[PDB]
RNA sequence: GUGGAAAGGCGGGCAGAGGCGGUUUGCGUAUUG
């Protein structure tokens, strides 16, 4: 297949590491507006200075620093998003979406990193009796992975910026020759270098709006303002596997993922079929796991029961996907105390350690919708 | 009322042929002051 289009079922924020200060914004109505400082500042000179360089650096009481253009001028906006929520007293930092010409698209590095989490989950399920024969070749540390006994039961005690997944990515994707440690990752040995995803077509201005993300898990909830693609927008993305790049590397790949493909048939032929069966088994499993916790908001469960009977492949993206959806640690729930000492080793809570709500405490949902759901087919 | 007189060290010759700046890594998560 080529040009496998998608749709959007919840708010979806792909960050760019940038926020809109209140000098960029003046909401005249329930609609909001993104003013053009470079053009507006250079357009407010004809009527005259050094006052703009003094007032913007001062940041006084925002509202008046954007409504002072209303005196003898008006109508200087760029994008003019919608607020779509009962907020905005400016006092906000709207996190902006990634845009190529002021037009929102989905980056392909972000949809590949979600498939890579789904594919990593499938490799650690099926592959401890076969995980030693992978590291039997030029690693010599599989005896430690055999005496502990499913390499996960060793890695909880093996650990006991952050390079925590360094060995686990080197077992499922790329066995190296040697290192100062036991093994390391080699980018030249990877089936995922044959997985080609591309940036999608740009979404559109009509489907972009500001949101009001409330954080739930504490008695005092906090709001975060953010912009995200509204649910119901459908764009098209093309994903294909280059099978010719796997035929050349039939002897050079050394990993547990390659030892999941030689059992479904020809390993350069079933990798694209293994790929989506890994998607609908990581993300349906994190979909069912969130029906256990009812701390959110009621209506959240009526979204999750409606995610079933929906054709296509369902997966998370973006910013509101929690620790449960960007991490192997869905599989590390069934350990309990084997992961309880290690979750405090890294540490989590700050400003000692969170005892009973260590990992799953935060839920970031926009307008009562669990954000970040995109369904391919 | 000179061991002198005259006599180009030079005519021809591409530092050339082959070679991907490359492979993996989701602007995000954690909690409060």
UniProtKB/TrEMBL annotation:
GO terms for molecular function: RNA binding. Disulfide bonds join 127-260. Residues 5-244 form the CRISPR type III-associated protein domain. The keyword RNA-binding applies. This is CRISPR system Cms protein Csm5. It comes from Thermococcus onnurineus (strain NA1). NCBIfam families: cas_TM1807_csm5 (TIGR01899). InterPro entries: CRISPR-assoc_Csm5, RAMP_III_fam.
């Amino acid at each position: 297949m080529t040009e496998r289009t998608l749709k959007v079922l919840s708010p979806l924020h792909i960050g760019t590491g940038n926020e809109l200060t209140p000098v960029d914004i003046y909401p005249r109505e329930n609609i909001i507006h993104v003013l053009d400082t470079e053009r507006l500042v250079n357009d407010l000179m004809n009527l005259g200075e050094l006052n703009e360089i003094l007032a913007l650096l001062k940041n006084p009481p925002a509202y008046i620093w954007k409504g002072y253009i209303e005196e003898f001028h008006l109508d200087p906006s760029d994008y003019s998003i919608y607020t779509l929520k009962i907020h905005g007293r400016k006092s906000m930092q709207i996190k902006e979406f990634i845009k190529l010409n002021g037009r929102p698209y989905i980056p392909g590095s972000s949809l590949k990193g979600a498939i890579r989490t789904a594919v990593l989950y499938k490799a650690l399920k099926e592959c401890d009796a076969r995980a030693v024969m992978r590291v039997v070749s030029k690693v010599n540390g599989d005896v430690a992975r055999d005496i502990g006994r499913d390499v996960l039961d060793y890695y909880m005690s093996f650990l006991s910026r952050k390079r925590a997944d360094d060995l686990l990515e080197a077992i499922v994707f790329g066995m190296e020759p040697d290192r100062r440690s036991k093994i390391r990752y080699e980018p030249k040995r990877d089936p995922m270098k044959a997985l080609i995803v591309r940036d999608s077509k740009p979404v559109g201005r009509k489907h972009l709006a500001v949101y009001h993300v409330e954080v739930i898990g504490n008695p005092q909830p906090i709001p975060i303002w953010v912009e995200a693609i509204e649910p119901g927008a459908a764009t098209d993305v093309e994903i294909h596997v280059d099978t010719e790049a796997l035929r050349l590397n039939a002897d050079y790949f050394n990993g547990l993922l390659w030892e999941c493909l030689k059992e479904r048939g020809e390993p350069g032929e079933v990798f694209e079929d293994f790929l989506w069966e890994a998607v609908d088994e990581f993300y349906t499993a994190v979909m069912k796991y969130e029906t256990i916790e009812v701390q959110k908001f009621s209506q959240v469960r009526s979204f999750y029961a409606s995610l079933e009977d929906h054709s296509g492949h369902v997966l998370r993206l973006g910013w509101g996907s929690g620790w449960l959806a960007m991490t192997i640690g869905l599989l590390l729930v069934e350990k309990g105390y084997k992961w309880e000492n290690v979750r405090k080793k890294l540490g989590l809570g700050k400003k000692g350690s969170g005892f009973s709500r260590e990992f799953p405490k935060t839920r970031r949902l926009a307008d009562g919708m669990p954000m970040g759901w995109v369904v391919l087919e």
